[PDB]
Amino acid sequence: PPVTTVLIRRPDLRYQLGFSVQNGIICSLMRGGIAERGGVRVGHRIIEINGQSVVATPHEKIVHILSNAVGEIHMKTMPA
């Protein structure tokens, strides 16, 4: 079970995480964002984000949470 837990740190709302989401898979990653610390691995398959299984959720929706996810984002990701 190579499941990684992305614990991102968001102090504000204008602080990008450092990656893009596509329904359930990641696209790119910026070596500097807080997403690196959390767990976000460009190439995995996010799913249970703070309790919401994005596995079958649109991309815009996932970006929304993270777009308005102040504090600390906690999600799970599998190997895609």
UniProtKB/Swiss-Prot annotation:
Domain PDZ: 5-80
Tissue specificity remark: Brain and spinal cord. Isoform 2 is expressed in testis and brain, but not detected in lung, liver or spleen.
Superkingdom as given in the UniProt entry: Eukaryota
Location(s) in or outside the cell: Cytoplasm; Cytoplasm, Perinuclear region; Nucleus
This protein's domain notes: Composed of an N-terminal domain that binds Munc18-1 and LIN-2/CASK, a middle phosphotyrosine-binding domain (PID/PTB) that mediates binding with the cytoplasmic domain of the amyloid-beta precursor protein, and two C-terminal PDZ domains thought to attach proteins to the plasma membrane. The autoinhibitory helix linker occludes the APP binding site.
Chain's role: Putative function in synaptic vesicle exocytosis by binding to Munc18-1, an essential component of the synaptic vesicle exocytotic machinery. May modulate processing of the amyloid-beta precursor protein (APP) and hence formation of APP-beta. Component of the LIN-10-LIN-2-LIN-7 complex, which associates with the motor protein KIF17 to transport vesicles containing N-methyl-D-aspartate (NMDA) receptor subunit NR2B along microtubules.
Subunit structure: Part of a multimeric complex containing STXBP1 and STX1A. Interacts with STXBP1. Also part of the brain-specific heterotrimeric complex LIN-10/X11-alpha, LIN-2/CASK, and LIN7. Component of the brain-specific heterotrimeric complex (LIN-10-LIN-2-LIN-7 complex) composed of at least APBA1, CASK, and LIN7, which associates with the motor protein KIF17 to transport vesicles along microtubules. Within the complex, interacts (via PDZ domain) with the motor protein KIF17; the interaction is direct and is required for association of KIF17 with the cargo that is to be transported.
Identification of the protein by name: Amyloid-beta A4 precursor protein-binding family A member 1
Organism: Homo sapiens
Covered residues, full protein: 743 to 822 of 837
